[PDB]
Design an enzyme around this catalytic site. Structure first.
Site, PDB file in Angstrom:
ATOM      1  N   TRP A  59       1.275  10.122  -7.836  1.00 15.56           N
ATOM      2  CA  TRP A  59       0.893   9.645  -9.185  1.00 15.56           C
ATOM      3  C   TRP A  59       1.578  10.412 -10.291  1.00 15.56           C
ATOM      4  O   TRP A  59       1.535  10.001 -11.408  1.00 15.56           O
ATOM      5  CB  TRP A  59      -0.618   9.619  -9.368  1.00 15.56           C
ATOM      6  CG  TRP A  59      -1.361   8.507  -8.654  1.00 15.56           C
ATOM      7  CD1 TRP A  59      -0.843   7.644  -7.831  1.00 15.56           C
ATOM      8  CD2 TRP A  59      -2.754   8.183  -8.869  1.00 15.56           C
ATOM      9  NE1 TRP A  59      -1.883   6.749  -7.411  1.00 15.56           N
ATOM     10  CE2 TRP A  59      -3.037   7.092  -8.079  1.00 15.56           C
ATOM     11  CE3 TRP A  59      -3.776   8.761  -9.621  1.00 15.56           C
ATOM     12  CZ2 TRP A  59      -4.288   6.543  -8.042  1.00 15.56           C
ATOM     13  CZ3 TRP A  59      -5.005   8.192  -9.590  1.00 15.56           C
ATOM     14  CH2 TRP A  59      -5.241   7.093  -8.804  1.00 15.56           C
ATOM     15  N   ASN A 100      -8.881   2.585   0.966  1.00 13.79           N
ATOM     16  CA  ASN A 100      -8.170   3.824   0.997  1.00 13.79           C
ATOM     17  C   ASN A 100      -8.807   4.738   2.007  1.00 13.79           C
ATOM     18  O   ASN A 100      -9.843   5.333   1.779  1.00 13.79           O
ATOM     19  CB  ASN A 100      -8.236   4.432  -0.455  1.00 13.79           C
ATOM     20  CG  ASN A 100      -7.030   5.381  -0.637  1.00 13.79           C
ATOM     21  OD1 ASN A 100      -5.896   4.903  -0.540  1.00 13.79           O
ATOM     22  ND2 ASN A 100      -7.318   6.750  -0.717  1.00 13.79           N
ATOM     23  N   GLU A 118      -3.467   8.355   4.285  1.00 12.70           N
ATOM     24  CA  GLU A 118      -2.276   7.508   4.352  1.00 12.70           C
ATOM     25  C   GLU A 118      -2.564   6.047   4.744  1.00 12.70           C
ATOM     26  O   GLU A 118      -2.084   5.167   4.050  1.00 12.70           O
ATOM     27  CB  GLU A 118      -1.169   8.127   5.258  1.00 12.70           C
ATOM     28  CG  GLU A 118       0.087   7.319   5.200  1.00 12.70           C
ATOM     29  CD  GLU A 118       0.671   7.298   3.845  1.00 12.70           C
ATOM     30  OE1 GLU A 118       0.590   6.276   3.123  1.00 12.70           O
ATOM     31  OE2 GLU A 118       1.240   8.374   3.474  1.00 12.70           O
ATOM     32  N   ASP A 120      -3.884   2.481   4.739  1.00  9.33           N
ATOM     33  CA  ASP A 120      -4.653   1.651   3.758  1.00  9.33           C
ATOM     34  C   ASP A 120      -4.801   0.291   4.380  1.00  9.33           C
ATOM     35  O   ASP A 120      -4.112  -0.120   5.285  1.00  9.33           O
ATOM     36  CB  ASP A 120      -3.938   1.541   2.442  1.00  9.33           C
ATOM     37  CG  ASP A 120      -2.990   2.652   2.123  1.00  9.33           C
ATOM     38  OD1 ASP A 120      -3.423   3.692   1.636  1.00  9.33           O
ATOM     39  OD2 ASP A 120      -1.787   2.500   2.406  1.00  9.33           O
ATOM     40  N   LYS A 133      -1.768  -1.407   6.235  1.00  8.72           N
ATOM     41  CA  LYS A 133      -0.675  -0.848   5.420  1.00  8.72           C
ATOM     42  C   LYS A 133      -0.370   0.596   5.780  1.00  8.72           C
ATOM     43  O   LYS A 133      -1.290   1.386   5.999  1.00  8.72           O
ATOM     44  CB  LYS A 133      -1.118  -0.994   3.993  1.00  8.72           C
ATOM     45  CG  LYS A 133      -0.116  -0.536   2.953  1.00  8.72           C
ATOM     46  CD  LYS A 133      -0.559  -0.821   1.534  1.00  8.72           C
ATOM     47  CE  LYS A 133       0.233  -0.198   0.465  1.00  8.72           C
ATOM     48  NZ  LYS A 133       0.196   1.294   0.494  1.00  8.72           N
ATOM     49  N   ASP A 134       0.882   0.938   5.897  1.00  5.56           N
ATOM     50  CA  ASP A 134       1.345   2.282   6.046  1.00  5.56           C
ATOM     51  C   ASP A 134       0.989   2.924   7.353  1.00  5.56           C
ATOM     52  O   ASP A 134       0.923   4.161   7.437  1.00  5.56           O
ATOM     53  CB  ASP A 134       0.859   3.148   4.891  1.00  5.56           C
ATOM     54  CG  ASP A 134       1.586   2.871   3.560  1.00  5.56           C
ATOM     55  OD1 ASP A 134       2.634   2.123   3.526  1.00  5.56           O
ATOM     56  OD2 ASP A 134       1.121   3.288   2.489  1.00  5.56           O
TER      57      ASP A 134
HETATM   58 CA   LIG Z   1      -0.801   4.650   2.223  1.00  2.00          CA
HETATM   59 CA   LIG Z   2      -3.994   5.599   0.334  1.00  2.00          CA
END
Ligand SMILES: [Ca+2]
Ligand SMILES: [Ca+2]
Length: 198
Positions: A59, A100, A118, A120, A133-134
């Site tokens: 971020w 998340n 990590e 998601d 995801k990921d």
């Molecule tokens: Ca992620």
């Molecule tokens: Ca995340």
């Protein structure tokens, strides 16, 4: 212990025993079944001093304020994730549920602490389907030691549990939260959590 509705509390990701990122949120709910907090547009972000084992929090691309639409985070105590209500920056339309996966939230004297894990999951607003995801990004990071084997097995099990829940129509969260809007006075929060001098 609980925080009052409307209290401003710290939401922290803790890495290497210290705050990685932290930002102020308002408390919507603090009950045994639900912690709900709100990150408002324009709020100040506090980042820890480098170096971290994982590198700087991503971020940091936004610099020091949240530039996008506000985020309502929904957490079931004890679970290794939270669910973010994501909206379109231009229209305000509800877009998606963003799961998340992260450490179960810890209550601190200042707020709540967690750590991103990590993986998601994303559920679009229409609730037709969901996506992982990921996963491979996670696995690469586990292989290079960002997560211990015990940590990584816990993370994989948590993500699998939520995916099984969603697919069975048994998602824990109340989807009516997608219509919630903050009180008119819930604007940017400017509080910094920096501890200068170290
Ligand atoms: Ca992620
Ligand atoms: Ca995340």
């Amino acid at each position: 212990e609980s925080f009052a509705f409307g209290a401003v509390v710290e939401r922290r990701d803790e890495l290497d025993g210290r705050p990685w990122i932290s930002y102020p949120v308002r408390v919507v709910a603090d009950t045994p079944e639900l912690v709900a907090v709100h990150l408002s547009h324009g709020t100040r972000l506090t980042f820890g001093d480098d170096p971290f084992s994982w590198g700087p929090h991503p971020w940091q691309l936004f610099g020091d304020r949240w530039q996008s639409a506000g985020i309502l985070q929904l957490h079931r105590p004890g679970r290794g994730h939270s669910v973010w209500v994501l909206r379109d920056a231009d229209t305000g339309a509800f877009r998606e549920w963003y799961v998340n996966v992260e450490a179960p939230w810890r209550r601190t004297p200042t707020g709540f602490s967690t750590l991103d894990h990590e993986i998601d999951l994303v559920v679009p607003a229409d609730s037709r389907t969901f996506r992982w995801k990921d996963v491979e990004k996670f696995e690469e990071r586990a292989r290079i030691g960002h997560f211990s084997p015990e940590e990584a097995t816990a993370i994989r099990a948590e993500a699998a549990d939520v995916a099984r829940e969603i697919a069975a129509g048994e998602q824990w969260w109340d989807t009516r939260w997608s219509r919630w809007e903050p009180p008119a006075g819930w604007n940017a929060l400017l509080q910094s959590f920096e501890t200068e001098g170290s």
